[PDB]
Amino acid sequence: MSNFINIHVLISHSPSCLNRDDMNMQKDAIFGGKRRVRISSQSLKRAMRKSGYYAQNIGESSLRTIHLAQLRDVLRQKLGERFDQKIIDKTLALLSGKSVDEAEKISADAVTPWVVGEIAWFCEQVAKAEADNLDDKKLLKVLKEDIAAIRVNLQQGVDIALSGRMATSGMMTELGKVDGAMSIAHAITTHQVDSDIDWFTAVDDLQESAHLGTQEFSSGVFYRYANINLAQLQENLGGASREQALEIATHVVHMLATEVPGAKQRTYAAFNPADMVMVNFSDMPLSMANAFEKAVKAKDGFLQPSIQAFNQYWDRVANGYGLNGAAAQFSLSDVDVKQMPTLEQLKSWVRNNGEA
């Protein structure tokens, strides 16, 4: 079994508030009839993009904005020495389908992930468009042939190759449509959680009463799920090699195993590592969330029975639907699938396509 690589993470968090809504309440979700603390998949993804590990191992993160007036200046500064400024000006308008007229504020339809590499490439092509000069329609008709050539440039912005982007206007609607390649779930707790309330005050040093405020917080064992479609990832990177894709996969495993959103970490600091990380290859994606459909109950904490329940349900599903794919598990607690003592050995195990 291959093509789909499944990443399962069990990670316990000390009292915190890693995700809020518009009313400063802790994000939740009802599973198995009982309340679970929830961390948004979007939150995890951004926590990955803007992480230092991403910068060190993957590189440039795409910048998302609607402010094309600012983007004009940015592109003019980063690509000014390479291209003519009128060319940049025309290119941005071609990609977006908006203004070019030195306006104070040029806003687009929605937040679109921009990568400087792709824009540089399209500038390099519109340089050839200056020759005849072929009309914009003719140029777009010309670029319709090599989509993969545009996808090759996307290696300067992998986050798009992982989460995809949606284009509504401009010439991006026919060229910038990217699907896949990483399906990530919302992190939910394996157990029922009743959120605690922190009643804080703000001490006025120049006065002896006071009004109180509330902040919702809770600890919990979260289950993170991710899935990578290797073929789609290769397509998003312009037919890149498989071996190159599995490395990105390993980086995703590591990040999903270590990265935690910075929400309220200055005041709660839930900098905890994952207690379990399992990776398995499959022809069809599979989440082990139903292992915790029946909310786990604390024997000696929630972590241990979460591990146990996870393993049990994995056994049931495995025996039930066949599932003869490469699987490896890394746990901190040595207790009752191939076992990996460290995380680095697990990543190396993934790099070699699950074999040995």
Next chain:
Amino acid sequence: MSNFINIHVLISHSPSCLNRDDMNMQKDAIFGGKRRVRISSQSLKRAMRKSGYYAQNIGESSLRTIHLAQLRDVLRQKLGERFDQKIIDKTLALLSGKSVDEAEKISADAVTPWVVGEIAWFCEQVAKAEADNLDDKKLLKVLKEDIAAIRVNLQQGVDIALSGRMATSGMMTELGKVDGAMSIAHAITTHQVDSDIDWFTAVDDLQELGTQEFSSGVFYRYANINLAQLQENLGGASREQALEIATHVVHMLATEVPGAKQRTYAAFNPADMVMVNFSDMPLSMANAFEKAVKAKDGFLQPSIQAFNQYWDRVANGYGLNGAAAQFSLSDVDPITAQVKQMPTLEQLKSWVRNNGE
């Protein structure tokens, strides 16, 4: 491994009068499915800011307030010999930012941490109004190009550099935006605190394991200092100095208790347990106590042991590279790792001062 310094503290003391609700009960939190006594981060932080050790080893604490009316009197009092009162009014009103009309009642969005130093600095800079005068917007434009100079002034108000501040209705919204550099967790007990006793069944065992301590409690405190962010927040400043301040923070987190009352084992040693660890990424050992630490002899020994084992598993499992040093002194129990053992807390502090040399 560097730039992040991790502070792990096991400190035993009274679980009764530390931090309360508005309804007269001790603050708590649920961890590992069991309820634990809690001390909020802000409680620990203020306990540090208004500590004596802070006043002697770090400097003057920031003055957090909302009353600008009460503030002007203090400012004019302390630094009136240096500047003009009308000028102080101008820079104040700009800085907060509502007109000071001697109305004796000015409240502005706060609580905000004010240090006298930076205010005096703005008094120095507003002298440029005695030049042309230059438009306040222009002065803002000039000051925004160099915020680090302002950050230099926070050496007299370190607590802001550690905890940070935010502005909303002042010009300082662009100048005083300070984040980091210390991330501090809520203090939670490593053990269940309420007696897990089924009394109804217990009455049967009346004729006839570990003993439980009630007046004492082993709290796990975690802290994390981003050295680079601290350097930036204090104005371009030597690493060595940031580590010095870091050592002071280690000591305070190791000893201080809200209400300033001492530890239950305070008479013998300076601290119950302190480990410091340099890393590229912050790491908390709270999950060492996810499984409730059941009483063996006391609560301290098994808490230390659990911490040790979990540190072993995490260290070997993920990455065992970073510089680390431990002050335990507990009975004959080893951390099978590459950590330096320190006989005294002062040796540990000194070890931190030298960047883990």
Next chain:
Amino acid sequence: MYLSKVIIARAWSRDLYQLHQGLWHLFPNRPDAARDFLFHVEKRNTPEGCHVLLQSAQMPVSTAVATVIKTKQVEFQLQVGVPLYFRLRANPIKTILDNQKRLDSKGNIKRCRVPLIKEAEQIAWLQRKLGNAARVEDVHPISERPQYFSGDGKSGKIQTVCFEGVLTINDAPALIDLVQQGIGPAKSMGCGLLSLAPL
């Protein structure tokens, strides 16, 4: 002496007065005068109601609103100089006479029971109440929410403290008497029940 666990429906569990009047109907005798029972609230929220640990001199009989879960006949056999665990929700007070010159029914000055708000005074109150019966080896004074109540025509307060710790027995019959009769005021408001256990 009978020890039981009882649950009271929410609709009959708003005030401590309601808990008392509701628990009362498990022993039909009038006027006994009673209470010949003590109780300790462990869980306050529904469903099914509020959970209660009820020590009494008779066997409880479940009603519509009051549901017995378990019942026990028990004989306290206490030995001397043996360390034990204890729990006691109590009302540590000081009877003083009113700074306000309010008048009672007799036309004299009214008295007021006030809570001891310092741990040392609470613990002192505890070991004082126990006396020669036992010596407090270790104690945790848990601060509780202030309880309010209604009826008959009066609205009042009961500030409670929950002591949990280790003690040692010096005199057994005295301690048995303390357990049976209760310790401190507000015995009808869920105070005075001394629970013991072996370590």
Next chain:
Amino acid sequence: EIDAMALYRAWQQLDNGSCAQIRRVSEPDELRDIPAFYRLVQPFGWENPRHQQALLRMVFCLSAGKNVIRHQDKKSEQTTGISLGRALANSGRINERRIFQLIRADRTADMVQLRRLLTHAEPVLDWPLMARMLTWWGKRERQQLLEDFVLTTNKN
């Protein structure tokens, strides 16, 4: 036969203890359980049940905080006071979709949501208007709330 603004004033002057007891409540029905509520609301409507529900609502809203709901008298030029919708709109912290969900809520739930909004908004309004809308709290009043909010944002 109408409830005065005095209640508000009373709520302002009441001590911190009872205010603490009232503030920490999840539902308006749970407000019945505590005595300080009865002591507060005794002059106005008990035992005439016609006001009871309304009172339960009003106090519940007031239970948001001592100075959450800021009262502002109607200007002589204003003719009508600032309404709850206009208040929540002027605050700028509230998103309209939660008021949508507010109009879609049923019985106790809506009050739960409403209080949660007030604490986050710190609104200024004419209290008798809010009291009047809370007395009935029909569909038309809800829809009117939404009218005020949406219209205020679109017009200003």
Next chain:
Amino acid sequence: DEIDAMALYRAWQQLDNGSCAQIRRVSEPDELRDIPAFYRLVQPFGWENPRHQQALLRMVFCLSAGKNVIRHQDKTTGISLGRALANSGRINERRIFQLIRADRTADMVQLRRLLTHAEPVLDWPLMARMLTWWGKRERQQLLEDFVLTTNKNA
């Protein structure tokens, strides 16, 4: 003297797919009161004057059939709703008996379902006035127009 302009219709034509989607998804005019896009649409004309509210609810409710369900055709006098529904040929007169016998919200519902099924061409201001009053004589006149036109085109 305050009249609702034909501009409303134009506005309805020019309104985005999102808000129009929010509006079309409605069972009754009170649920039309429930949604905000409606208030944003109907304010200029306007909604804040209760004399106009009912009429606006009816008009907007009818328009909510679709963006191009009601087709406006300029005129002596323009084609009436009865004449329109009759000319469509898809409507059975019994359902109009129902329409004239219906009460309150129901009739409007029945009316909307007809429009979607008819795709009628008519002078919008006429329908606007009839919806403005919608008395017994408007109903009666509607049925009269329908029956007479159908009888005249058979």
